[PDB]
Design an enzyme around this catalytic site. Structure first.
Site, PDB file in Angstrom:
ATOM      1  N   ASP A 160      -0.195   1.138   2.591  1.00 27.21           N
ATOM      2  CA  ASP A 160      -0.022   1.006   1.143  1.00 27.21           C
ATOM      3  C   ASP A 160       1.394   1.344   0.692  1.00 27.21           C
ATOM      4  O   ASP A 160       1.575   2.166  -0.208  1.00 27.21           O
ATOM      5  CB  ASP A 160      -1.087   1.790   0.342  1.00 27.21           C
ATOM      6  N   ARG A 180       5.212   3.204  -6.258  1.00 28.10           N
ATOM      7  CA  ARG A 180       4.330   4.236  -6.807  1.00 28.10           C
ATOM      8  C   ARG A 180       4.002   5.300  -5.735  1.00 28.10           C
ATOM      9  O   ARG A 180       3.687   6.427  -6.091  1.00 28.10           O
ATOM     10  CB  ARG A 180       3.033   3.616  -7.330  1.00 28.10           C
ATOM     11  N   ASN A 181       4.064   4.946  -4.435  1.00 26.83           N
ATOM     12  CA  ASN A 181       3.825   5.888  -3.343  1.00 26.83           C
ATOM     13  C   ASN A 181       5.106   6.448  -2.744  1.00 26.83           C
ATOM     14  O   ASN A 181       5.102   6.882  -1.603  1.00 26.83           O
ATOM     15  CB  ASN A 181       2.969   5.264  -2.250  1.00 26.83           C
ATOM     16  N   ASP A 219       1.854   9.578  -0.405  1.00 23.61           N
ATOM     17  CA  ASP A 219       0.455   9.089  -0.435  1.00 23.61           C
ATOM     18  C   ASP A 219       0.071   8.255   0.791  1.00 23.61           C
ATOM     19  O   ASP A 219      -0.085   7.033   0.696  1.00 23.61           O
ATOM     20  CB  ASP A 219       0.120   8.327  -1.721  1.00 23.61           C
TER      21      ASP A 219
END
Length: 264
Positions: free
Chosen positions: A137, A141-142, A155
């Site tokens: 992923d 955002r991570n 994350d």
């Protein structure tokens, strides 16, 4: 082997974020680093304490413990003195890269700054590729942004970031990660915009699987767009290695192309 932090050494100050897992707090930590008596850390607290998720927490904590790299967020240990189970990470002032790009876009980050962010994400990815680790992923955002534009990865189905073989066959490899990196490259040069913002969740899948590529961002030099196109080969074998992508990015980071987004 995971480090254990005593609860009385952790002082919660302000909630930074949250999700279904639990909450993330800004906290002060004592007796963590030798030079500092108290220092800012980000603590992830877990909503469940049951054995089913207790072992899953320990699995992530051990994995986090093993990963050590300049561009992978620092993990400091755990507090398993009752519920909730705490997880201590270093504090990254500017939060996630997605919010940082949006807040610094139309002061606005320059081409060199954008290339530096990209190079740092690829550096952390080179490390994961070397250990045969598949992130699955990878997205802005991570990723977190600390002091002085230091970007790191965190994350450890986002179909918009996924390549065709991952969407259709649920197959995630180092090559599927390379595709996701090119999507992350697009996110950087668009100041945090969503891949295929114009399309619905199902329209995007049809676009990706048919072989459509995201248009070159306005602030993206053709040289950087060439790198994203190298990440988006339909065949995972024909996609560039992350070590390669990083090195190309590294060259432009030191010698940025004389490109003005205004000229096109």
């Amino acid at each position: 082997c995971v480090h254990h932090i005593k609860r009385r050494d952790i002082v919660l100050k302000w909630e930074l974020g949250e999700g279904a897992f639990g909450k993330v707090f800004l906290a002060e930590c004592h007796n963590l680093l030798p030079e500092q008596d108290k220092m800012l850390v980000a603590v992830k607290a877990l909503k469940e304490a049951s054995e089913s998720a207790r072992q899953d927490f320990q699995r992530e904590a051990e994995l986090l413990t093993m990963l050590q790299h300049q561009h992978i967020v620092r993990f400091f240990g755990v507090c398993t003195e009752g519920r909730p189970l705490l997880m201590v990470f270093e504090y990254m002032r500017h939060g996630d890269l997605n919010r940082f790009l949006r807040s610094h876009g139309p002061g606005p980050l320059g081409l060199g700054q954008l290339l530096a962010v990209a190079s740092q994400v690829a550096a952390g990815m080179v490390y994961l590729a070397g250990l045969h680790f598949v992130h699955r992923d990878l997205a802005t955002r991570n990723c977190l942004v600390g002091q002085g534009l230091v970007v790191k990865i965190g994350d450890f189905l986002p179909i918009r970031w996924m390549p065709p073989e991952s969407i259709l066959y649920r197959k995630f490899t180092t090559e599927s990660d390379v595709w996701s990196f090119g999507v992350v490259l697009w996110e950087i040069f668009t100041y945090g915009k969503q891949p295929w913002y114009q399309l619905s969740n199902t329209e995007a899948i049809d676009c990706i699987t048919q072989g459509r590529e995201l248009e070159r961002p306005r602030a993206c030099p053709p040289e950087v767009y060439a790198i994203m196109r190298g990440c988006w080969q339909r065949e995972p074998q024909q996609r560039h290695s992350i070590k390669d992508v990083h090195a190309r990015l590294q060259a432009l980071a030191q010698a940025p192309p004389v490109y003005l987004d205004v000229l096109g």
